[PDB]
Symmetry: D2
Subunit: 298 residues, 4 copies
């Protein structure tokens, strides 16, 4: 019954019970919701957008000069059509902020991303408390569970990309659930180009200006014992939609022990988060002894 | 007075003198013309288009599987937005046909490119004879001059690409003339996305279905003693234009001695074609003695 | 009690029972043996060696020209010390021979590798029959089990490399067992630079001229139900040892169902070989449902 | 009459005239000399050596983990023999110190390279004054000429590498002169593996412990009007020689106008240093008009 667009300002007013029930429905039946009025000004978001696209334009002009020169060595003229327009870089925020160390950024850009990261962290931890309330758990339970020793892993994937040549090329393309905790996507434009899978069929995430698309990953499903499931999805670059994405991942800390909350109890396993990501990466079957056991299980 | 669109069938009929004068004007004042009715059926061109896009789709599906796997090693989920959609490969035709050796092609594809290359070679050599006539030179003079010992260098750059994220990113992007002989561009769609520079300003090459965009390179300017100049240009991927290009270069042979025709005589130099491409590639100033002389000249 | 050096000519003579018992001991307690007098002339091996090093020298001279040119673009002089001396390429033999398709080889080289591959296949299948006899299995049981539908996967990794800068850099470097069936290593020089792990400690494979170092992989351990174990090992480039390796892998076919032989019966699993290599590669935990089950097992 | 080994401490003592004449001979007839007792303690050099090799060992262990993982995706086991042992990175000192920005270094390492760079700068500027005296020029003339506006380009190439597989592979390998000003090489071991060309034949640079191999580049030849020539040379990794190099280049500033000193006057050209490096890189013949003129000259 339509995608959950949720006005987050309504959670400190008279329409709170409706808004929290809307979040509850989203968490249980969609695994995805779109936030508006979320305590991050348009001032801040447009500043992030303007400067990211500025940095992107520098990288593309630099890339073309290098392409023209490298192609010229082969006795070949580089065209603009030979461009790899894709550019992606990651920024660590927690536990240690890696914005200082990332190459080729303005200082004014670095400051705004430190500010932007601080604001999202509060939003993420606010949302986790709203989930804690809907689930019937104490405030900061999910923040606590995500902490481990050092603290939770938090970071932003900043990517700029062209549109797809034709949509039919993305026909038999593989989808996924996010392995992490909670994910917050900020984009330019209205159109995200993001689809999710509900009851066998693709639904587009509706376009909204100045919105944050939130979704739940595999860890929240383990902690909620299957109640809040991580849903299948895929992001596709639309012809006249978004061409810039800022996916911010708030996952548990490396050494954090993840398990279903005792109260919320067919049964999801107990494990350390780094082991889950080591299974995901495929490092846990480099020795032969693991492999024989896994083949015995299958 | 509008871009030269030239119906090549008219060169064996009553409207020949007009058509040859149209080619003459194009050669002298545009360095570029667009051919229609050129002795290559729509049957053949659409067969080249269909199968190239088929091969492109295989490469992109393969590239995504590898991207998903390689990104997964870093504990990162690959999105479709992370795709490098650019794919380019070259096919040698003359003097030795390298279609047999190029990896990852269908046999049905290889055959059609051998056929397509044979047809373009005849078209290129036909066009060169039409230029020979307009200039006042014997039939096959330009074919002869291009030959050297082994024969002329002929090959096709086959590229598939996405559209540019925004046209403003291609604002301060560098243009060029082609270093070679004569260049024949076949694309999908009507819109080439190709602009050329005439009297300080960009003119778009008009869209035409089933056309071959011909243009003259630096060598024909040397051979014509500045009469047929190689013009500045740049190709840009339009949002809903062409996303496939087949640039076929008919250049002189490596050891071919290029110089202005004695009859057509401020004075263009004499040189071997490989030396020109070695200057272009920047191999001719690796030793210090060349560099001191070049700095003495400047 | 010393590494098993096995003269294979002795298997059709009076010293056969001793030689087969030597193979039995090697298969059970070493997982590794070194063959001499193996039905491949020194004529053939030296022809393989001479031409591989010839092809390697072409690739290195070509690589330096490209390195000098690519570095020159950055205003930097390339030194010989900037060389990546490592060069590796794979040749498929069975089920479909890919020697025809591999780029940048002489025809005389291609022919000898087709011959060399044919000879090794016979040697591998001979050795498998000798193992079949020692185990108490019918002739061609292991060849049969490896077959599947199309046939067994057979191919050669051809690599050329420099020596290690210092041996201490290879101190905390990870070792492994081979995932495949049976592996046959041919090298230049006497010194392989190959060590294997027996009872907690590294033993060098002894140097022998014109030898083939054979070893058993994980699949033969599954088929023998732990009787012939695949042993840990690592190959290291010695300062004045081998600088060329030809590791030939005779593994089961993709769709071959591997399981312990009924007669030889704590219990090794049943599985298709492609699933084992998909676990090895880490493709079998890209979806979330597999991961939750694996974490439930641990 | 043997390579010039020069004790630099002797320039403030009774054997000064002999030592300066030794430098004069080296500058005129060798283009190369080896310094000992040069005002940089063994304390400092061994500290640079120890920590660089430490950083190198971290990079190689990291590279192997990535190699094992990336190869595992293809169903292939990575061996130690598959290692690219080559590792090179550049450090800018003047005009702006880029040691702060270079990734993956210890802070203790960064400090020592800032100290090491400060000491070499003084040595380089000392040597330039000694050349100024031998030539008959005022103190700091070469420092002045190198300055331009911002200051001289100064930086260190820090590289670690394996030995060459066989010396015959480096048979037909191309040599060069250095395009810059003055170059100072510090290595581990005694054996540099460095040869230079004098009267048609290769001479090895003699091995010396704790030495700095100095040589003159193309710019000093222009400034001295051919009197101090930049000599041909090549560095080769010896089997049991040096496996670490620190080539420090003290070149003129980008905008510095280089020309023969009026007093020292067949005639070397006047030019800005960035134009010389743009000719070297091959950027100055991307447009057609330059190319026609260059072919007219030839
Ligand atoms: Ni996702
Ligand atoms: Ni062009
Ligand atoms: Ni192995
Ligand atoms: Ni040098």
């Amino acid at each position: 019954e339509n995608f959950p667009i949720i006005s987050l300002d309504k959670v400190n007013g008279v329409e709170r019970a409706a808004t929290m029930e809307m979040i509850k429905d989203a968490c249980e039946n969609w695994g995805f919701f779109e936030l508006v009025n979320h305590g991050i000004p348009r001032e801040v978001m447009d500043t992030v957008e303007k400067m990211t696209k500025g940095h992107y334009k520098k990288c593309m002009e630099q890339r073309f000069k290098e392409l023209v020169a490298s192609k010229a060595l082969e006795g070949v003229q580089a065209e603009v059509t030979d461009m790899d327009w894709e550019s992606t870089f990651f920024l660590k925020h927690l536990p240690i902020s890696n914005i200082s160390e990332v190459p080729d950024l303005d200082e004014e850009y670095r400051e705004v991303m430190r500010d932007f990261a601080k604001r999202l962290e509060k939003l993420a931890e606010e949302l986790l408390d709203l989930l804690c309330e809907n689930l019937g758990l104490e405030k900061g339970y999910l923040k606590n569970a995500f902490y481990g020793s050092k603290g939770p892993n938090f970071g932003t994937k900043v990517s700029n990309y062209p549109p797809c040549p034709k949509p039919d090329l993305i026909k038999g393309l593989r989808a996924h659930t996010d392995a992490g905790g909670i994910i917050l996507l900020f984009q330019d434009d209205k159109v995200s180009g993001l689809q999710l899978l509900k009851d066998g069929q693709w639904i587009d995430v509706p376009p909204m200006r100045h919105s944050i698309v939130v979704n739940l990953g595999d860890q929240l499903e383990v902690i909620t014992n299957g109640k809040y499931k991580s849903v299948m999805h895929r992001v596709i670059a639309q012809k006249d939609g978004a061409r810039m994405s800022l996916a911010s991942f708030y996952n548990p800390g490396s050494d954090a022990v993840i398990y279903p909350a005792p109260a919320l109890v067919q049964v999801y396993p107990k494990f350390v988060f780094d082991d889950y990501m080591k299974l995901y990466a495929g490092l846990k079957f480099q020795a032969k002894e693991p492999r024989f056991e896994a083949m015995k299980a299958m």
